C-alpha cells in the first residue's frame, strides 16, 4: 500500500542519516 | 494519495538532512 | 486536506533543519 | 481539526530546532 | 482528544530539544 | 487508549534526548 | 495491538539515541 | 500488517542512528 511504502521511504532516509553520522565518527577518528 | 505524497516529502526532507550531515563529515575531515 | 497540509509543514520544517546543518558545515570549513 | 493543529505544533517545534541549529552555526563561525 | 493531546506532548518535547540546542550555542559562544 | 499511550512514550523518549543535549551543553561549558 | 507495539519500538529506539548522546556528553567531560 | 512492519523499519533505522552516535562518543574519547 502507498502509506506503508511512504513510511518505508522515511525509514530509508533515516538510514541515510545514520550512514552520514558514521562518516562524522570516521572524520573525528582521523 | 495526498497523505502518501506528504509522507514522501518528509522522506525527501530527511534525505536533505543526511546530505547536510555528509557535508559536516567532509568539513571535519578538512 | 488539512492532515496532508500539516504533514507538508513538517516536511518544510525538516528542510529548514537541513539548511541550518549546511550552515554548520560552512562554519566548520571556515 | 485537532489532529491537524497538533501536527502544525510539531512543525513549529521543528522550526525552533532549525533556529537553534542556525545559532550553533553562528557560534562556530565566531 | 487523547491522540491530539499526545501529539501536543511530542511537540512540547521537540521544543525542549530546541531549548537544549540553544544552550549548546551559548556554551560554544562562551 | 494504546496508541495515545505509545505516542506519550515517544514524547518521554524525546524529553530524554533533550536532557542528554543539556548534558552536552554543560560538558562544552566545562 | 501491532501499531501501538511498533510505536513503542520507535520510543525504545529514541531512548537508545538519548543514551548515545549521554555517552557523547561523558566523552566531552573527559 | 504492512503499516506496523513499516513503523518497525523506522525503529530499526533510529537504532542505526543511535549506533552511529555511540561511534561518535568513542571517536571523541579517542
Author numbering:
A (entry chain F), B (entry chain G), C (entry chain H), D (entry chain A), E (entry chain B), F (entry chain C), ...: 1 to 30
What did the article's authors report about this structure?
αHBs are oligomers of 5 or more α-helical peptides that assemble into coiled-coil structures with central solvent-accessible channels. We targeted two properties of αHBs: oligomeric state, which directly affects the internal diameter of the channel; and the identities of channel-facing residues, which fine tune this dimension and introduce different chemistries. The αHBs are loaded with an environment sensitive dye (in this case, 1,6-diphenyl-1,3,5-hexatriene, DPH) that binds within the channels and fluoresces.
Despite the requirements for aliphatic residues at a and d, up to 40% of these can be changed to other side chains without compromising barrel integrity. We introduced mutations at one or two of these sites to generate four groups of αHB: Group I had entirely hydrophobic interiors, but with different sizes and shapes of channel; Groups II and III had polar uncharged or polar charged residues, respectively, at specific points along the channel; and Group IV had aromatic residues installed in their channels. Focusing on the small molecules, the αSA signal from the more-polar AAs and CHOs is dominated by the polar and charged Group II and III αHBs.
